[PDB]
Symmetry: C6
Subunit: 220 residues, 6 copies
């Protein structure tokens, strides 16, 4: 990673054995449950492209997913190249060549170049750009290994309303839509997929009941 | 988190794997037992909004609780906005735009903005403000998911007084109320709901007895 | 905690996940065995009142004990208030308001105030004062969850003298008396509660035998 | 390893017990699965030749592989020597003798010489040069100890396409070849070795379909 | 402990949870096996008296041993007091009162006094002096709780000589005696208490044989 | 150990609980398998003589081996004394007495003297010298607890050639000879001890086949 030391300077540090192991274990234990994304995001804080590639290369199995991720990266890289074309010419002392997409993904760039960009004044944050690409791919994978649509989450006749709501929002976490789309669909669908006794009570509350009010109302 | 270096400046440090894992495991092991709240507060010391979002996003399951938490945050954010409305205009050099509620929650703010607020002179402690909102939400969840009401804690005929007291205060810990209200509940119910023999002993020691005295007086009864 | 950094200045640091976990595990594993006190004392090295409250708030169960602790704190705080009454008036630049008992316990004081006191020149060590109150309460709890009096520790007829002595002093650790009182009672009671064959030998050694001499003498 | 201190100088640090143990355990648990290679590369970041030798010397068992690794290193060392022959003469103050192949591998060089190379201005990165040799050797071992050939990965009649793709790329990961060669193997075999129903679907999407599209198109077939 | 910072000054650091737990677990697992002594000495490196008291206070059980340890300390403290009596009078600025035995053991001294002694120029190393007393006490305990006497270590008829030697030196390790005395015990008993066949072989190699030679000579006998 | 701090100075640090535990566990788990030597070497990086003695004193059991180690140290120390005799006289301010062998082994030297030597300009690296002595002894012990000669490692009739080669080189790791002696013996002995079907194929390859070529040739 690139971190600040105790004396106020951005420096390169080795990825730690703890970080590496934390990520490997997360994938082993949880596969591509939604929570693997914020865990990846937090474990990769400060990462260079080389560090990100290391993390992705240590994933055991799941190589269909990992290839889909490479394809997502390649599409983002091609968009970057269209938007930020490289001008040819000798690079001046006191300057860094402009990165292409393949450089941000660490494929055609050296570690020294990556540090150069990430610590330039002003910085070209190739780590952060690459990470955003990876997260877009990881979201696709989460959605793909999600077994269930929110349309199929229905409260059972004897199912406590809290357990139903737990299942509903856990399923929703795996959907790949904006938060606004998720929320408004949810309002109405949560009621619609409730069991007849709860649905009755929930209709009675009227629009604009908070979840807390809903869960109190259907406690038994 | 934001921590101080040797130069005496506040700077950003990455959240540690140890922290992340400690939080994940505490939720796994304890759910929304009252002690999850101080563990959250301790593990999130110095946290940015981004860090707090990370910690909440890694909670496995309990999504009904997490959704109720978001709703609490949205309520606290609307109030923030009502009390502290943003004034339009360009931001001066070395200065920071005023945060809206959604900026404090990390939704409409970048990491670099959060660092800027938390390290400005004087600080706008958006991490601390957000943590307060989160803790309020967690207190609701703890209460919400408490199985027992304090009114139903009654000493059994053969139950040692110490075990009853343990159960009474464990229940009271999950209530969402000020300390002064919880002290009123104790004064109303603890002696009253003791069993007949202990109750007789306790009524005799009177209102002013310490818990240690009460527990000594009922050691056999 | 408040610690010294590498460059010679008292600064606030976050309580570490290790410290938190060590304390939680100690209580889970050992409850209020006497050794929990020096473990609390060592894990709370440098603690602010806020840190101490955190540690106490993480104790799972044992809420009768924890309430007795709060009552002990309140009594110590009232004594502090009697001994160190607060004078009213505006606080000068370059000064800290005088702490009341409720401030030392962290109830009516902010973290910023606690750091202010603990790093003033000269320091008001509100962490150390509060800790002393907590330890007084913890000692009361140890004594309370001690099942056995030293008067009931008697060497059995076939019990190796070493096992008896182990039981005796382990029980004595849980008693709440001064060390002088513990020692002198012990001299005589250890002999008196020994089994008839050992008691014979121990009488024969005369007064002022060390424990080592006693344990050698009753080895079989 | 060689790491930077506050003065901005590169200095020597002892290899940590955590690092040592992480490497030992990864070999124990995963043998020469492809993912052992990036784990080695990450755990050996900043390593001196001495450190790399330590890590290789602590591998338990697998001595046939380790001997093949030494042979690869000896081949790379002979080539180094052919490209970069040492010139005789006394070494000037503040300067370092030019390394031979055996110096890079840590066999004929002291720790103090390795530090001198890695911290000189500009660096002679003998740790990085040796790591490259080691990684080449490990890639041979991974391939050598792979059980399956890519030609024998064929989708079963009832095998979900996702499971076949997992197996195909897991096999391809163990091949020792450039990325461009591995991409050629995919273009030759993946659709061709799908089962009859999936293959029909995939041939219709055509050469330009992404894996995500292919996996959507065969979700039931 | 007292450790050095960057300014090259000795300063106080809190005892770490790792240290505390390592000590607790070593006693739990090994009791008063001889190797507990160097583990104590290593874990208490730089310790103040306060720290040493903490480590001793966390020992679970073994209170007969711990009481014998206190008695040893009291004996060493009385001797200290006899050799180094305190002189009355007010302490000058930047100076420290002379420690009594009970000050070294941490009983009548504050932490701030201990820091003052250990960091004064020149140091009064009250941590090191106390550790010496503690180690003397622990050596007594190890000996006290050793099950076997060296006189009873005898090679069995079918016991490999290496196993006998292991047992002989493991027993000798628990003895409380100088190294020169332990070397005398070896010269008296090791060959003498070997079985008839090994003994014959060993007597022939003679007094000057190394252990490695002795163990080679008896590899089958 | 003696390490460099962040501000470029050689200082003494306490041996860490991690280091201590790593070494204890290695011996418990692996005894004196060859890999215990590079593990000792790496865990003792920067060690003083006192640290090395600590590490050796924590070894549980294996006291025959440990005594053989002391004997090896004593022989190396006597050689050092013959080669570097100590001249008598008062030691000047700005100087360190010359170390004898017993000083390098930490037996007659204080920690303060060891730090003095290791941080003198120019350094007398008593830690590194002692470690070399210990490693010579440890190699003797490895060879001694090795159950098997390389002459007895023979490929079985149905044994995969890779498993045979694994056994052969694992056995060779425990032999105490130079690397040149190990290699040249190995070339020929590996073929000679192969089973008849492999030996046939290996003869056919001719001299100077690499191991990789040999293992490919006998894959079935
Ligand atoms: C033609 C280019 S492309 O294919 O379109 N895109 C890319 N190719 N590469 C890899 C490369 F750089 F090599 F071209 C790309 C990398 N890439 C990679 C990637 C990282 C990755 C793994 C993953 F699981 C998912 C991902 F999304 C990304 N690893 C692999 O591709 C391994 N692989 N291999 C096959 C398979 F082939 F076996 F099937 C599969 C996989 C994962 C899924 C299936 N590792 C590196 C390691 C060192 C590096 C360098 C040195 C050392 C040691 O000294 C070291 F350990 C590592 C240096 C540079 C790179 C680097 O740039 C990044 C991004 C793109 Cl988009 C590509
Ligand atoms: C739209 C307004 S709102 O919904 O009324 N309020 C909020 N929306 N958001 C989320 C968002 F920001 F997306 F709008 C909000 C966040 N928010 C979130 C929150 C954090 C959170 C989780 C939790 F379990 C309880 C909570 F109380 C808070 N995560 C979710 O909402 C996930 N989610 N999702 C569903 C769902 F699927 F059902 F939808 C559920 C959940 C938990 C319960 C059910 N994560 C972030 C991550 C990155 C971030 C940025 C970058 C990376 C990668 O580098 C990364 F990993 C993360 C950047 C910004 C944000 C951010 O701002 C904060 C607060 C509010 Cl109040 C809101
Ligand atoms: C009228 C005052 S008093 O009651 O006489 N004395 C005290 N009240 N308080 C608590 C308070 F401050 F709230 F008044 C007191 C505290 N106190 C507490 C204490 C700590 C404690 C726990 C314990 F197990 C034993 C103890 F001895 C002490 N916690 C509780 O009381 C919890 N509780 N709750 C009930 C029960 F009610 F459910 F039954 C029980 C318990 C333990 C036993 C049974 N936590 C804090 C947390 C934040 C803090 C602030 C913010 C956040 C988050 O942002 C956070 F996580 C923590 C800020 C300030 C405080 C603080 O000052 C300290 C000392 C006194 Cl003496 C008192
Ligand atoms: C002679 C030339 S060569 O053989 O062609 N090439 C090499 N010989 N050496 C080793 C040596 F240096 F000794 F010559 C070489 C080393 N080398 C080694 C290597 C490292 C290694 C292990 C491995 F598993 C795979 C590898 F690829 C490399 N260890 C071994 O060879 C052990 N070995 N031993 C047998 C055997 F028993 F079967 F022999 C086997 C093995 C692994 C497979 C089978 N360790 C060192 C340790 C100290 C070192 C120095 C000091 C201390 C103590 O303080 C310490 F612990 C270690 C100092 C210097 C060296 C050093 O230079 C490096 C590279 C080459 Cl190519 C060679
Ligand atoms: C009176 C003179 S003496 O008895 O002859 N010698 C000594 N008395 N003390 C203890 C004392 F200081 F209290 F006098 C002595 C200490 N001593 C102790 C010792 C340490 C110890 C434990 C052990 F297992 C073996 C030992 F050899 C030494 N603990 C005990 O005595 C506990 N104990 N208690 C009984 C008993 F219950 F049976 F009594 C037993 C035992 C072990 C065996 C049986 N702890 C301290 C803690 C705080 C300290 C201060 C503050 C806090 C909190 O913040 C804290 F947690 C701790 C501050 C000061 C002290 C301190 O000075 C040191 C040395 C002497 Cl020689 C004596
Ligand atoms: C006449 C000298 S010699 O015998 O020829 N050589 C040596 N004697 N010593 C030890 C000594 F220094 F004491 F003389 C020697 C040491 N030596 C030792 C050694 C280390 C060691 C252990 C081991 F397992 C293998 C080894 F190779 C070396 N420990 C023992 O000898 C223990 N022992 N004991 C018996 C047995 F006797 F019970 F059987 C056995 C053993 C291992 C095998 C069988 N520990 C020290 C600890 C403190 C030290 C000082 C203070 C404290 C506490 O405050 C502390 F914890 C440690 C201070 C100084 C020393 C120190 O110098 C080093 C080297 C030589 Cl060659 C010798």
């Amino acid at each position: 990673p690139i971190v600040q030391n105790l004396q106020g300077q951005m420096v390169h540090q080795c990825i730690s054995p703890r970080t590496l192991n934390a990520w490997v274990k997360v994938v082993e234990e949880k596969a591509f449950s939604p929570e693997v994304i914020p865990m990846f995001s937090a474990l990769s804080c400060g990462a260079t492209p080389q560090d990100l590639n290391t993390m992705l290369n240590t994933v055991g199995g799941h190589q269909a997913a990992m290839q889909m991720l490479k394809e997502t990266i390649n599409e983002e890289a091609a968009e970057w190249d269209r938007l930020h074309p490289v001008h040819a010419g000798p690079i001046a002392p006191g300057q860094m060549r402009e990165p292409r997409g393949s450089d941000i993904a660490g494929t055609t760039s050296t570690l020294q170049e990556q540090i150069g960009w990430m610590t330039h004044n002003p910085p070209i944050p190739v780590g952060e750009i690459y990470k955003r690409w990876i997260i877009l791919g990881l979201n696709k994978i989460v959605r793909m290994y999600s077994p269930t649509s929110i349309l199929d989450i229905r409260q059972g006749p004897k199912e406590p309303f809290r357990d139903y709501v737990d299942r509903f929002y856990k399923t929703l976490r795996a959907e790949q839509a904006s938060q606004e789309v998720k929320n408004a669909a949810t309002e109405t669908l949560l009621v619609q997929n409730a069991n007849p006794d709860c649905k009755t009570i929930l209709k009675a509350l009227g629009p604009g009941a908070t979840l807390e009010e809903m869960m109190t109302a259907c406690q038994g």
